[PDB]
């Protein structure tokens, strides 16, 4: 029954400077749990398509690094133990994306990260030529 009357909206200002034009938002999320990465990329693409932008998906290969440690303590060389760090990649590329749209989307995603994940952003924006040339 409790339904608020006046919803507080933040202030916004459209400054005189023209907004910057990002052309490729190519994000690469590295993690350990393929299911977590699948849920995360579904979340991302769903938010993107609800905000009204293009999307694409592809899964780069799995990278693994292993290294051998001694299984025992003092003297046992034949008997070793192994380990492996598995990193799984997922890429998402967005095209023709306005600067403020990039701002809002990156705020949303960066707050909506899970814990055990890393993420590399690559931003490509076109611009005009200088004046000294």
């Amino acid at each position: 029954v409790d339904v608020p009357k006046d919803l507080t909206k933040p202030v916004v200002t459209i400054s005189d400077e023209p907004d910057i034009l990002y052309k490729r938002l190519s994000v690469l999320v590295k993690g350990h749990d393929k299911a977590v990465l699948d849920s995360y990329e579904y979340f991302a693409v769903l938010a993107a398509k609800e905000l009204g932008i293009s999307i694409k998906v592809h899964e780069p290969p799995r990278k693994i690094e292993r290294f051998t440690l001694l299984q025992s303590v003092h003297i046992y060389k034949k008997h070793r133990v192994q380990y492996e760090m598995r990193t799984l990649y997922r890429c998402l590329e967005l095209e023709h994306l306005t600067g403020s749209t990039a701002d809002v989307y990156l705020e949303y995603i960066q707050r909506n990260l899970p814990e055990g994940v890393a993420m590399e952003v690559t931003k490509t924006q076109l611009e005009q030529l200088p004046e000294h040339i």
């Binding site: 701002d103 990156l106 705020e107 960066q110 707050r111």
Partner: protein, 113 residues
């Protein structure tokens, strides 16, 4: 001014109330600024006091007290090259390097060979 600051702090203490939302907690953390600043530029702060790329790289102004031919010139050219190539240290540390080299060869100015 000071009494208006007392007034403002007591007004703030009157205003403060318990929050009921994790979003409110995030708002508070961002208010004090401990929460990181999205977008993560990795450079929010640490601006090097508004230093400049040419201030870093062009050491021709810092190189004035020796001719353009000698082995000291060769060595200090190599120095400035390495300094401009290195981004990690700033113009300040570069200037201290240059000053220590100046002091070194000026206290060993006895040779000039």
């Amino acid at each position: 001014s000071l009494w208006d600051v007392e007034f403002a702090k007591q007004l703030a203490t009157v205003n403060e109330q318990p929050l009921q939302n994790g979003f409110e907690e995030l708002i508070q953390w961002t208010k004090e600024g401990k929460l990181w600043e999205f977008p993560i530029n990795n450079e929010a702060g640490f601006d090097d006091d508004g230093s400049e790329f040419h201030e870093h790289i062009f050491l021709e102004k810092h190189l004035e007290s020796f001719p353009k031919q000698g082995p000291i010139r060769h060595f200090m050219e190599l120095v400035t090259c390495g300094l401009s190539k290195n981004p990690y240290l700033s113009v300040k540390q570069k200037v201290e390097h240059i000053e220590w080299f100046r002091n070194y060869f000026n206290e060993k100015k006895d040779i000039l060979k």
